[PDB]
Structures are given as structure tokens and as C-alpha cells.
Amino acid sequence: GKRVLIVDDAAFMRMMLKDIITKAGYEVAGEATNGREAVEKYKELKPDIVTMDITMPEMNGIDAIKEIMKIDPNAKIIVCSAMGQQAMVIEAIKAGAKDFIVKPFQPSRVVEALNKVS
């Protein structure tokens, strides 16, 4: 109930997040750079939580949310967005995501999101 799958194309953002996740005592089940991989790794790892980057809509992360819900209507998915993406956040929340964080990350906020959702 502590395994997280991180989805984000930015290697460095991924790492940062891992640092945070890990220090807060959670565990990194795995990493993905895009929606398809995520789905595939989600099926393979059955992670506890999923962190999903939605900054670039052309990546269709929202569609991945949905794909995963089909697969597990119990999935707990947090979404990373950037400032001013409130509309996407709402669509993601609309599609099943439980919460959202904003870049640039505030360790405390991410820990809180994680915890709330766990």
C-alpha cells in the first residue's frame, strides 16, 4: 500500500519525485515516460498509487487515467500539473483521479497528497 508508479517524461522530474516519495517512506514500484507504458506497467506491477504527469495534453495522459480505470476501478491516481492547468485538473478529477499536485513540487504537498490517498 506503499508502492508508487511514477509517470512523467522528464527524467529529472522523475528523480526528484523519487527522492521525495522515498524520503517520505513510500516506495517506487516503477517508472514510465508515457501513457502506454504506464498502462503496461500498471498491469505488470499493480502499484499502490500512480503519479501521472498531465502537463502536456498532447501526451494524452487523461486518456491513460481512463485506460487504467477500466483495468482497476480502484486505482489511486494523483496528477501532476503546472500552474494554470486547473481545467485539465478538473477533467482528470472528472475521469477518476483522486488528487493533484502542482509543479514545481512542494515536498510537503506531495507527501500530503500521497498520504491522503493511501
Swiss-Prot record:
Keywords: Chemotaxis, Cytoplasm, Flagellar rotation, Magnesium, Metal-binding, Phosphoprotein, Two-component regulatory system
Main location: cytoplasm
Recorded GO CC terms: cytoplasm
GO biological process, one term: chemotaxis
Cofactor(s), by name: Mg(2+)
Location in or out of the cell: Cytoplasm
UniProt remark on cofactor binding: Binds 1 Mg(2+) ion per subunit.
Sequence positions that bind Mg(2+): 8-9, 53, 55
4-aspartylphosphate PTM positions: 53
Domain Response regulatory: 3-118
A single MF term (Gene Ontology): metal ion binding
Post-translational modification: Phosphorylated by CheA.
Stated role: Involved in the transmission of sensory signals from the chemoreceptors to the flagellar motors. CheY seems to regulate the clockwise (CW) rotation.
Name of the protein: Chemotaxis protein CheY
Species in which this protein is naturally found: Thermotoga maritima (strain ATCC 43589 / DSM 3109 / JCM 10099 / NBRC 100826 / MSB8)
